[PDB]
Structure 1
Amino acid sequence: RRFLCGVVEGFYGRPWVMEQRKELFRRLQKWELNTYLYAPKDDYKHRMFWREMYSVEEAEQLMTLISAAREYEIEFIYAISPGLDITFSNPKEVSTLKRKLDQVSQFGCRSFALLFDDIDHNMCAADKEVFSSFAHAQVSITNEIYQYLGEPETFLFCPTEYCGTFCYPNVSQSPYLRTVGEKLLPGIEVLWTGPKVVSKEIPVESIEEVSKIIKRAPVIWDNIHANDYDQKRLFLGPYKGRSTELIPRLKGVLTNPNCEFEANYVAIHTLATWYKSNMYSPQMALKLALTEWLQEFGVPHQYSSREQFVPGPNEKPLYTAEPVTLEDLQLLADLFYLPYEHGPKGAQMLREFQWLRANSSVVSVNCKGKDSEKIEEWRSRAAKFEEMCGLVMGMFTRLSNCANRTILYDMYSYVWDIKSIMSMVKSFVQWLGCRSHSSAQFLIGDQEPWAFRGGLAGEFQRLLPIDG
């Protein structure tokens, strides 16, 4: 039995380059994965201008990538998304799609996919006179393409209603999915993403409900680590929340990685472990992933003596950089954990800070003669919070000195922002702790840099509704 496991390059943003993709292939082979799907959202010749043909230089790029994929025995799937403006009743459109796919095949590509995600539900007047339904036209054109291509072993189709939230009135009773299942040829595999676009968890019953319609096992398009619906968020947590009992009931798992190329080591490693387990413990998987990931940070750059000055007792020490530790990586993971939850350490820090803020007025000003136990407890908790903030700042400082700065420079902004905000919060906590003998306003320097926050974004965020 064959099974699909791999990655889908289908995020919005600056697309990855050839070197990154080759390194990705090497990692995929190391981790015993087998599938790469190429459907970048911002490739003009993929979605927006699919009708155009590739040039000689683009042809060389594609041929090099496909040959590299063949070297590492990783299946390469090329996708097309003509749903933006294709007319189904015009033979010229079908011929153009056939010619495009033939140009792709000429390079040596083997597997092809057609996507109709994120388009409208309407058709032109011409198609109304031919097809009874939108699904009818989609299925007819997909079947024609599949027959033309020679019935390859692998072929992927994404229904417009790729999630339950987009099915009306429900998954079981949707006429679109019923028509698809009735009229789609048996040789095509169907993509699905779960109850929601970003599914927090996937119960088996929903997958069975989908199977009862599509008459085949689906292929999971998991956006558990996608970050193109709010690009301020980075996700480094392990693959979590999907039950392994789905493995016999699925044709394959394909993961959407983070837009930043070097931030997807942990997610892909955890996915590989998750699949390999049952041909599972999210905490153990994360621990193993970080243990393996630490090896690629190397050592911090150090002065190389490979006649050198050596200081004495009265001379300033030479600058030295500490190595990056496992604890730093764990803390970094907890700071950027999951789309629907934080890590244990980040959540605990947030709760502790909220508690400290809540009871600041208990002992802040002129608290002599009050309960000493409250004063000591508040001071101790504040000190522990200070230690946590110092740990975060030290993590950033140590990561800054890594010799292999490629890892950091692809995620520099997020870590720098989180360490800056931790520093600001530490200053705020100190000012709260000094109220009884200092009446000065909370200030960093002589002013309030936090008032500006993130400019317009932050000022608009400040006005959004909250639970409290």
Structure 2
Amino acid sequence: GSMLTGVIEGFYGRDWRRDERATVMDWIAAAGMNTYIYGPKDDVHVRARWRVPYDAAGLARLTELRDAAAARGMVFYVSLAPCLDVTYSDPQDRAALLARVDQLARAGLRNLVLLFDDIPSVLPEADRHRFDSFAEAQADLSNMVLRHLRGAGHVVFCPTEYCGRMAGGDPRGSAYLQRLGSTLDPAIDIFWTGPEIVSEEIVAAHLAAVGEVLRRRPVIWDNFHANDYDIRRVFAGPLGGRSRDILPLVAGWITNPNNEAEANFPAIHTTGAYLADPDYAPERAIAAAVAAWQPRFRLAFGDGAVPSDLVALLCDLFWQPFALGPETTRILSALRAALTVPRPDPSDPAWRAALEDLRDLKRRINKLFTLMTEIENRDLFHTFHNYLWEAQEEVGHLVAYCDWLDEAPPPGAVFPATDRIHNFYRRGFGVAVQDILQRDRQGRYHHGV
């Protein structure tokens, strides 16, 4: 029945504003979820200066957040990361962590996340005589925190190895997780991101193996909708790659979403749908999300709104970490097939259809882009402005190339790029690296043989 479900503010970049946190909490509550975790990397007291307690203002914002979540039938957690230059056995360090916990506890914030995701290269020297491993040291420090709470509230532990790859493939083969699962107090839940930091799929056999080594069902920390790893990307598609059959194997489900608060309407809608609806299907879920989301696209000067089909296009373009949207996938795939020859036949309906859909894609992106400039909510506009520009430019250049092939140029003729494509397109440091570190169609890396 009951289970921790919701969002972690846990990404690398600027933290959300008070109003953005309120909007997101609204969306969490509307989606049937019950948790907000405060842990933005931008907060100095979480990680960088973990020894230093909050001043009155910092603590007041936290209690306000707890109250705001409470009013929506939600729980609120506060993160700490005492892992940067911690001596796990040291009195002053243990006491300094206890003071942090005491402050939060005396202010009524007894729901804590302890993070241990970034440590030094070997065990500290003053700790080697007390503890036999990082796992045992972290476990003891966390158990101290749990015991200070006196059976009230809840502790969730982020491990150093929090995915399959970090644990070495099969999590049951990790020395770290073996010692962690046996040493961390049974009352403390453990985060897990699946086989990777950003998991393409989270499957039942994986989670069963994780539960074995951890000695408890994991709380999922899903990075499926996270975009902090790529400046070029945002994820407005549905949650995918997790069957509902995995949910019996977890103790919780927290999602670490896009940096841009306004980008997360579909992430929250569809993740809530996944957790609630036994018939969850990503393409049906995104349709329901798009219908709910569409009134946010009202136009500023007159009685219009961006059409549902163009909002749907927005999600298709900006879909998922390991898939383009169904429309965009098929358009590009059709073009690839038609481009197996150096000169496609302009009379061939395969080519003609592929080109026409590409042209139509261009016209629709243009329509969407123009209408986005006209919406009332400028935060939503600026969320997608640059991502939309990028897509528009790419599609335009592909259209100009395919249009030139549609004239049936001779085999020796070369595409007149100087007249058709801007000089500034596809340049810089990342392109220079990608020119050396090539990747072929089957996914294999090479440097041009």
TM over 0.5: yes
Listed one character per residue, the Cα deviations across residues 21-75 of structure 1 (whole Å, up to 9, x for unaligned) are: 1121222222221111111122211111111122233233223222222222310
Q: Which amino acid aligns with 1:6?
A: G
Q: Which amino acid aligns with 1:82?
A: P
Aligned residues: 440
Q: Which residue of 1 aligns with 2:377?
A: 404
SS of the residue corresponding to residue 221 of structure 1 reads strand
User: 1:226 deviation in Å?
Assistant: 1.3
Task: Map 1:139-150; keep pairs closer than 5 Å.
Answer: 139-150=139-150
1:378 aligns with 2:351: yes
Counterpart Cα distance in 2 of 1:361 and 1:227:
38
1:346 aligns with 2:331: no
Contact 1:31 1:272 in 2 (8 A): yes
Q: Which amino acid aligns with 2:162?
A: Y
Q: Which residue of 2 aligns with 1:315?
A: none
User: 1:324 deviation in Å?
Assistant: 0.9
Q: Which residue of 1 aligns with 2:259?
A: 259
Counterpart Cα distance in 2 of 1:169 and 1:255:
23
SS of the residue corresponding to residue 172 of structure 2 reads coil
Identity of aligned residues (%): 33
User: 1:331 deviation in Å?
Assistant: 1.4
Q: Which residue of 2 aligns with 1:458?
A: 431
CA distance change for structure 1 residues 241 and 447 in 2, over 3 Å: closer, same or farther? closer
Q: Aligned-pair RMSD on alpha carbons?
A: 2.4
Q: Which residue of 2 aligns with 1:388?
A: 361
Q: Which residue of 2 aligns with 1:222?
A: 222
User: 1:84 deviation in Å?
Assistant: 1.0
User: 1:257 deviation in Å?
Assistant: 0.4
- Return 276-285 or 170-179, whichever deviates more: 276-285
Counterpart Cα distance in 2 of 1:132 and 1:118:
19
SS of the residue corresponding to residue 114 of structure 1 reads strand
Q: Which residue of 1 aligns with 2:306?
A: 324
Contact 1:238 1:285 in 2 (8 A): yes
2:422 to 449, 452, 462: 449
CA distance change for structure 1 residues 432 and 44 in 2, over 3 Å: closer, same or farther? same
Listed one character per residue, the Cα deviations across residues 98-142 of structure 1 (whole Å, up to 9, x for unaligned) are: 111222223332301211013335221110011111111111111
Counterpart Cα distance in 1 of 2:321 and 2:136:
36
Counterpart Cα distance in 2 of 1:444 and 1:197:
40
> Quick check: which has more Rg, 1 or 2?
1
Q: Which residue of 1 aligns with 2:233?
A: 233
Contact 1:260 1:411 in 2 (8 A): no
Q: Which residue of 2 aligns with 1:201?
A: 201
- Return 447-456 or 335-344, whichever deviates more: 447-456
Contact 1:110 1:152 in 2 (8 A): yes
Is there any run of 5+ residues in structure 2 with no aligned partner, and where? 442-449
Counterpart Cα distance in 1 of 2:52 and 2:287:
46
Q: Scaled by the length of structure 1, what TM-score is found? A: 0.88
Counterpart Cα distance in 2 of 1:18 and 1:348:
41
1:61 aligns with 2:61: yes
Counterpart Cα distance in 2 of 1:344 and 1:350:
10
User: 1:444 deviation in Å?
Assistant: 6.9
SS of the residue corresponding to residue 410 of structure 1 reads helix
Task: Map 1:275-314; keep pairs closer than 5 Å.
Answer: 275-278=275-278, 280-298=280-298, 300-302=299-301
Q: Scaled by the length of structure 2, what TM-score is found? A: 0.91
User: 1:330 deviation in Å?
Assistant: 1.5
Contact 1:452 1:459 in 2 (8 A): no
CA distance change for structure 1 residues 102 and 379 in 2, over 3 Å: closer, same or farther? same
Q: Which amino acid aligns with 1:352?
A: A
